[model samples]
Structure formats: structure tokens, C-alpha cells
Target chain A: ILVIRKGWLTINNIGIMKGGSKEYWFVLTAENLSWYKDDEEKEKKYMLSVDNLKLRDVEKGFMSSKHIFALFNTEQRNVYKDYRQLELACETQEEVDSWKASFLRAGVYPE
Target chain B: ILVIRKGWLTINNIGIMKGGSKEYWFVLTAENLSWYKDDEEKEKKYMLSVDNLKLRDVEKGFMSSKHIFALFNTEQRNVYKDYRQLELACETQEEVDSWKASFLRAGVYPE
Candidate 1:
């Protein structure tokens, strides 16, 4: 599948490193979301999955405009639950809109 | 205490949503590494802590030039282990050095 978009993204955590996030190489394909420690590496040892993917906006809630641009899933819990939610940060709301479009193209969310 | 440096940082994750990263508002203080869902809010419900913190350069590891600028903690694991490592991304190598300076000033690592 052709990669719709590829770049760096930050994700939120719950436990020991809770309240903190990290950046990695994100590759969005037609049916999968793949990431690598280094996106530039030739030999790819990447993580690939598209488990129950959902997208939600974080701008309407506790997080401010700049803290969290959007969430990867609808599952929003201060406490860790059955699954993990990936938080995506963008430079602006405009960028968030652009990202949402990418996710839409990748079919990560519903119409 | 003065805020050493405050800005958006993207972090790396292990599984489910592996190989990807998300951006967040990372506030580095004198004795705490506090982060909020949104950095610009007045009424703050923020996460505050100073656990066993460390810093590492992801450039030396698997991640590439733009993917990961640096890792907040030294603990690097492909497999999710005991602790989570925070990945920081800057636009450039110069930005990485600037971020490292901020972490050093905040005491996330030693001299």
C-alpha cells in the first residue's frame, strides 16, 4: 500500500512516564499505521498495526489548544483502560485539520 | 522557580500504536517535569513528578535525523519494559542541542 503520509508524532502515556510523551517515525498506509525508531533507517524493524483505530478531538476538553491537538482514539481515560490512546500534537488547529484529513484518507475514522 | 523551557515535544511509544509519536506541552521546572493537556490554560490540572529521570540521544540508536531528536530517559527498549522513555523532537540538530541544554538545566540528567 502507498503511504499516505509519514512524519513524527507524539503519543501520551499513563503510568510511570505518565503526563509525558515521545516522538517517533510515523508511517500511515492505506490499511496500517507503522512506526520506526528512526524513520530514515534502510533496514526496517518497525511496529505495524491498525487495531480498533479511532480518532477524537482533544481541543474541546481539559487539554488546551496547544497541549493536545488530537487523540488517536475515542477512549479518553486518565487511567489506563483496555486500550491505549495516541495523542497527536500539531503546530496549529489548521495543522490538526490537515492531519484529520490524512487519517480520513487512511480510513482511521468513520464518515 | 523559573520555567527552564516550555514547548511542544513529541514522544515515542512501543506497541499497539508502535513506531509513531505524539506531541505534548512539556514544562520543565526546577524540581519537577510538569505537563498539561494544554499549556495555555488558566485552571491547570497538570501532571507533576520527578521520578528517576534520564536522557539519551536517539541519533545514536535506531531513529533517524528528523524522527527523534533525543530521548529524555536513557532507558531504550524495543520491548516495553520497566520504564518509559520520553522522546523529544526538534526541527533540527541545533534545536536538539538547545533541548538537551534545557534538560541538563532541569536536572533530568547529570554533568
Candidate 2:
């Protein structure tokens, strides 16, 4: 297993970047932000990732005031339109504050 | 998220390859077998992987009858000693049977 920093953020029931056919379940670890398409239908379950995440504030979002969104810098280009600036969201301002702090401690700050 | 096979197997209290410092919690998905150092100790949790794994029978084990173990082949060299033949274990026969069948459907059979 990869050595990750302490602190984690789990945001359930979110729509991933660019929107899609399904909602997703997300987990933010010290080093990566990972997610999976919600498989409530029970067809399958899998997790995916983006690494070297430098956390930042969200530019666009749903309920910009109530809902929480954040951005990240990355090196991986596949599975995403841009190699950097991946956006993520959470349900409440509490989640936003908690996630930002957690990621910062997990070493997701500016390099 | 990536398209994964339907079935999944979770094994708790497992000591990974050649044994180590801490026990692990594992998740067997359709395309990969992932695990993390048990984060019950207030540590971070991050998942790691082996891709295109072809399932095989376990060669080494713990309580070979009650604790279930299995092997897998891979092309990647990091996170494992050999590029092929990665061994894993579970706590029961039911877990063993269930995981084998799940991986088989996940396309991990003799290929």
C-alpha cells in the first residue's frame, strides 16, 4: 500500500468533473484524490485516481455558497481533459473547510 | 470511474506478502486487487494496485484451511517482489471461494 498522509475526506453523492451519466463516491487521501462511479445498481465497483494534487479554491460550482468545490493541480493527463486543475465538490461548507485542511495536512499544498 | 466486474471480496486482518509490520484491509475489484495499511491507528488510508492480474492458486498460507490465500500474476514490478505470482490471503473458506469466483468473472482466470 502507498504511504499516505493522515486525515481523509469522504464525500458521498457527488457529480464528477464535466458532469456525466452517473454520480460518484469520492475519497481524498493524503497524496491522491480518488473516486468511483456510484454502483448502487450493483453492476460493478472500482476506484480511480489523480496524483500530485496541489489543492486550490473552486472557480465554478453548484450552489457556490452552500455547496463546496475545490481544484487541484496534477501531472496525469489521461481520463481528464486537462492534465491540471481538476475540480471536486462536497455537500456543505463544513466539508469544504474540512477537506481543504485535511488535504493541506496530507501534503496537497503548493509545491 | 473505471468499469469493473460486479462482484467484490473484502478481507480484514490480512498480513500482506512475506508478512510485515501491520495487518491490512483488502478490496478485490474486477480489474485489480487493492489494499491499504489498516488505518485504524489514526493514519492515512490510500489504495494501491496491480493491473491485468491473472489469478492463480496460493502457494504459501496462514492456517491454510481457515485462512485463505491465493496468487496472481502481473506485469508491473513495483510494490511486489516479483513481476508475477503475488500472494494474498483471507480469513475464511467462504472468502476464498467467493473471491476466486469474483476474480474469474472479473477476467482473472487463466488467460
Candidate 3:
């Protein structure tokens, strides 16, 4: 029911900042994410990136301002903490249908 | 070379909005992140959450407006795309040293 837009839909991670003296740095790519829609060429755009933190070397200012960004996998989402799941969403309803993962709720993955 | 600050550091993922008809939704937890600096007691504060996208089920307005956020793992960082990498940072120098994961660059894991 959803229509295709971008040639490909990939993820983008921002960064990961520590509170103590710890440091985490790395990059997220587009190839890591796997989608059930993979078979469908146009739907592939839904497959973006798998990420956890930020761009790696950005810069730390204030703790609150250090909020980072990035992409990630489905397993990471359901398990990792400090995240808000209920509010997750899509750019368009079509994108949701296009995700192609099957999802745990979709009955594709058992709980 | 960072310092510790928070009781424990963590991550937060926003959301993933597919340019195509794809939909990605989920939440990240803290238990998932693997840290090398897990020991040494007090240093654990650097450990955070593992994330990929945004908080699941949020409201989606426009395509560009759909940028999501969340937390993630170190592998999720190096391998995954869509993330910038160079802009990553910490709340404070102490936090940089608090992350538990040893990371690849630290030579903890061989290239």
C-alpha cells in the first residue's frame, strides 16, 4: 500500500557520549540493516543503517547538549536500554509498510 | 583519557523514517552494550545504551522531518552507515573514560 520515494532508504548515526571518563567512538553504515523487503528493489530504500551512538569524534559541550544520533538493528532496539519505544514512527505510513522486516508484532518473529 | 561523572552512562535512539515505503520501530536497552572497561568498579559510569533509530511509534509529519534518535553498541557504530562518526563526543572528559567497552581503535579488538 506504500509507495517508493528515495532510491534507497538508509540509516544515519550521530554519536555516543559518556558521562564519566569513558569514551565511545564509531560509525554506522547502510549495509548493516537487513529487511524482509530486500527482495523488492524499490522497497530496499527502507533498509537504512544499524547504529547505536554518534559520528565518533564530534565534540562534547554540555552533558545535555551531548545528545547523540545514529542508526541500528531491530534486535538492538528491543534489548538496549535508555530508549523510548512507544514513540517510534515513520516519515509516512507507506514507509512503515515498506520496512520489510516482518517484525515481532507481525508474527514473523516470536516473542 | 576521559573522566567519570554520572552514576552510569547510557544511550538513546530516536527513530528511523524510510524515504521509501519502509517502516522501522523499536527501543534500545542498557544491558546490550558490551564494555571493556566493565571492571575497575566506579569506571562503569561510561557504559551507556545500544541504539539504532528513534523512539518507536512517534508522530511522523514529513519525510525530512522524520529524523529519529536512539542508543546503540560499538559494533553498531563501526559497521553501520548513515552515521557521521567524527562528531561523536562525551558529556565531560570524565565520561569518556567511563564507557565500559574497550572498542576496536583502542586495539582491544584487532583490525
Candidate 4:
């Protein structure tokens, strides 16, 4: 069966890198999923659900991956562009983190 | 020109202070306004209008104020609560900063 799932949508804007340090501001959105239709016959929506939902549970799970915008050393500026997925939980803040449990995926970005 | 503008809105959550410093997680939103009417019997809605809108431009103009929650030191815990305004541009990150130019006033939070 084909599946359509809603999950985290991240928007990374500005990046900052200077003085041997790097930082950036990003917007990570875990949809308050409200609508879903499966197979063309019927649909289901939830005010909030913990099943078949997308997005990690930040307090528990984590983001698949994150993009590096404007790294501190102008050496690799604008060299990356993609909705790169995070397959495992990040163990440190040097990467992305989140907790929004709603689905059962074999991996982070299950197709 | 007799304005009703909108700009940046910041919502902060989660604070951290393990070391000798403090940090936090926050959300900043700049709205795209839709409606404005000066008087009775009249209302106008624009798809994208700069008039009578509200929200600050992070790339420019700054926020009038901000709030600091869960600052380090449970010493003086919960001794404060208010929608404090910035009133000036920040010279350093030790304080809050923003730019959302909509109305002109000698001060902020107009009645």
C-alpha cells in the first residue's frame, strides 16, 4: 500500500560563523496534523494523535538531520541544499534535536 | 502615512543555565497582515499591504521589547513577570534585540 505521511518541516534562514564558532537560526515545524486521506475513499484527521504520525518526539526522539547554513568559516558557505533526512538520534547539540511522536517508521525519513 | 503596521513576534520557551551563563529556545514570527479600516462602515483587506499591518522585519527594524524567562540562579526565582520592552537597539547579545517598524511613537506599547 502507498502511504502519505506528514512530518517535520524545517526552514533554515540565516547562518552565523565567526571567531572559531558557528551558529544559525532555524524554524522546525512539527505539523499539528489535521487531515489525512488514504487510498481515495476516506480520510481521517485528529486534533492530536500518537499513531502513524510523522516527526520525532524531540524530548524523546530527534530530528533526522539538519543543514549547515552560513558556517563560521566563509570556506563552505552556501555549499549545501537539500531536505537531508536524519536517520538516527543526535547525541549532541552540534546537530538537530526534536520530540514529536506520532508515527511508526522503520527509520527517520521513511518513504 | 497614518499607518497600522505589523512586525516580528517572539515566543520563547525552554531555558538552559548549566555553566556560568544562560540560554534559551524561542520562536520569532513576523505576520503578513490582511485587514485594515480606519472607521465605521468600512473594512479593507489586502493580499499584501504595508498599511495597518503588524510585525517586525528581522532583517531590519527591531523589536520594542522582550521577556527573559528562567534566567540562571534559582536564587531570585520567579521574582518577576512582565512584557518588558527593549526601548533601544542592543549593542550585544547579553540582551534582546529586534526590528519591526510599524508605528511611530516616543515610546512602546501604545494604548
Candidate 5:
């Protein structure tokens, strides 16, 4: 299998319904997006299927930076639901654009 | 400064005038593209300014895979000149496209 993209990304810990963020090593393959505790890729944290992935730019909030984006399951109505969506932050607007482009190339569509 | 993209890429060691390949952790920033021996990012290998970076797809050969691309200095007359060109290989065609998009977003152009 081929790896589409991989790097460090700050992910919002929405799994516990919390707003805190944690950085993880994310690996995006053709069929799945997986995250690990580190770049060693020994321990995997979670994995999401890209089959019905939908992406959108996240609106900046009082405590939020502008370089944020969100991924959601196409069938999900609310993005806040646990495991249904993922909020990712990048270091710059260009990074966000590049990531979005990569996801699109992997068959994840824009919202 | 913003990180445009980061991942593992196989680079053709043309610096030594050799055609052998080696994998490295590549990080693409707003102003430069750098590679490290590992994802730890501790030891610095080399960095190239993105100012006049040019990109193009490399034709596949008997020993080369289709998922290969090259970067060159815009001012360079020949790509084979050491330190003036870099040939990178990705795991998949999608990865190649994604990396190219990220470079384009970072102001590198296609040739």
C-alpha cells in the first residue's frame, strides 16, 4: 500500500468531548488516516476511513488560530459528535491549503 | 513560519554523483525544504531555499518507479549538476501529486 501523506498535526481531542489539543504523527494512506504517538509509528492511536470523508475550513474563534480545518463523516450531521469528526490545526494558512489539497487528492472531498 | 508539509521521501543521492536512493524525513517549510536522517529532526542534513525551486515529473525507467519527481533551481541550465537538482520518490502516485501540490502552495512551480 502507498502512503499519501504523513506528518505532525495537532488534533483536537474530541474523543473525550474535550476541547484540548494534542500533537500526533498522522499517516494518511489511500484508504485510511491513522495517527500515532510519535514519528516512530510504533504505537497507533486511532484510524479513520477516508471512504466518506468530508473536509471544511474551520471558522476561527476567540482562542483559535486561523489555520484550522475540520474533517467529518459525510453521514454525520453534527461535527461535534465524538469520532465522527476531527478538528486539525496547522502551522500556517499555506499548510492548511496544502493539507486540504492532499486530502482532496486522496478522494476526500470539500464540504 | 509555517510548515507546508512533512513526510518520508526517498531521495536520489546525486550529490555524490551516484544514482542510489535513500529514505529521509523531509520537511517543507514556507521558505525552505529540509531533510533529516530520521523523523526525530535532530540532526540536520541539508536545506534548500524555496525561492527559485522548480518541480517536474520524472519519466519512469527500468529501475525507476512511476511515483518520482524532481526539483531544480530555476537558474540551473542542467539538472544533472550536483546540488542543483534533487530527485524524490514517493510511495504512490497520489503522494507524488500531493507533495507537488504542497510545493506549489509553498510557491514552487511546475516545469
Candidate 6:
């Protein structure tokens, strides 16, 4: 299909050593959300399918100054591999809402 | 304010000599739409104010295999400096619609 939305978003790594957030270029299509190392879109990092995707808002206290949200697969298929959930942060609440809406349009629903 | 949306978009330069399109990292905020040389956002190319901004879809025939749109200032006060209008192309119509909606949320209106 076509891209529903695409932008730069910060992904929070939840682990012992990788306990930090980094920015990446994300492109969301109807079927999947793909991220690249840079805006050049040459180096693709990974792609997550929208099928059985679940989204939720992260508590503000978790992040110091970020509008954080989470996305995970409802099914136990483990599309994320090592990661159980994807924690993403937006620059603003408006951006978060926009991303939520776009995800919904891309076939993801609230759980 | 935080960014509403940011991603790589192809900009079509309209001129006798500059008759081509190139991809650039664009960040849309509530106040302005800023473009940079890359996704790092280190070197800013230009920033166009959302105030009095106008948006419209371009005819598909103008550029083959591109979902094009135009953004311009309603008032004669050119915030774009040398250029009169900004011709932007998205990978899909869904992206264009999402951009148009985000621009509206940023106080830009249709004309």
C-alpha cells in the first residue's frame, strides 16, 4: 500500500545497558512501520507489522521530558523479536495524537 | 512548541534552470515548517511560517508518478523569500492527506 504517515520519532530502549532513547526516521504504511537510520532512507533498521498491533500511552513520570507511548503485538507471535514492546516518544502531545490517529488509520486499534 | 510532523519529502523546484525535485528532511511545527539538509537537523535550509499558509492538491499530470501538493502564503508578504510557492511531493496520497490535516492543526487553512 501507501504510506499513512512518516516522521522522526525517538525510540526508548528498555534494558540494562541500552537504557536510552535515540531518534530515527520512521515511515508508517498500511501494513507496517519501518524505520531507517537516517532520512536518506538507505539503511533500514527494522519493520513492524500493523497486524494485531496494540498501542498505549506511557505515563509521563516514566520519561523526564518526553511524550511517550508504547506499541506491542496483541498476539504472542513476537514480531518484535527481542523487544517485548516498542516505546516511542514524540516531541509534543499533538504529535502523539497525530501518530495515534495515523496508526488507527493504518489498521491498528486500541486495546 | 514541539514538532507536529517531520520526515523526508521531495520538493519540486519550479524554474527554467532548477526544474527538478530533491528529497529533504522537513519538520512541521505549530508556527513554521522547517527544512534541513538532513535528518540530523543540524543545517537548516529554511523555515516557512504557518501564518496565512494555504494548501492545495496539484494536478497529477504535472509530475508523473508523484502525489504532489502546493503550499503558499495567502498574503503578499512572502515568507518564502525568493520562491512564491512550495511544491511538495509525498510517496503516497495518504501521506499527503496526513500532512494536510497536520497543517490544518498547525493553523494552516485551505484556500
Best by lDDT: 6
Model 4: per-residue lDDT, tens digit, B5-98?
Answer: 3322222321215332122122122322232333231554222322232222222322211222111112222212332211222222223222
Model 5 clashing residue pairs (backbone): none
CAPRI-wise, candidate 1 is incorrect
- What does candidate 1's lDDT look like per residue over B1-111, in tens digits? 887888876654322133244566788886777555567845343444444566666543333446354333333441123223444566677777787788777666641
Model 4: DockQ score = 0.02
Q: What does the lDDT read for residue A30 in candidate 4?
A: 41
Clashes of each: 19, 0, 114, 36, 0, 0
RMSD of 6: 6.7
Give DockQ for candidates 1 onward, in order: 0.02, 0.04, 0.03, 0.02, 0.31, 0.20
What does candidate 2's lDDT look like per residue over B9-108, in tens digits?
3332334663542444455555455544442212223333435556555543354444444454465543344334444555566767776776666667
Off by over 4 Å in 2: A1-111, B2-22, B39-51, B59-66, B74-84
TM-score leader: 5
Q: What TM-score does prediction 6 earn?
A: 0.58
Candidate 1: RMSD to truth:
17.8
lDDT of 4 by residue, A18-105 (tens): 0111221222224222333332424442232222323322232133333321111122222223212122223344443322222223
Alpha-carbon local distance difference test for all models: 0.56, 0.47, 0.28, 0.26, 0.76, 0.77
What digit string (tens of lDDT, one per residue) describes model 2 on residues A42-90?
2113333435556556544354433434454465543343334445555
B1-111 per-residue lDDT for model 5 (tens digits): 656567778985444444458888888878989988886789867888888779987877777754788888887755444555688987667667768777877899999
**Error at A97, model 4, angstroms:** 16
Residue A91 lDDT (model 4): 33
Could you give candidate 1's per-residue lDDT for residues A2-111 as a string of tens digits?
Answer: 87988866554422256344566778887777666667845453454554466777643221123354334443452124435656665344456767889888767741
User: i-RMS values of the candidates, in order?
Assistant: 14.3, 11.2, 8.5, 14.7, 3.7, 4.2
A1-111: candidate 3 lDDT, tens digit per residue? 222222223222212343332222211133233333333434432232333311111232354423222222245432122232212223344644443332322222212
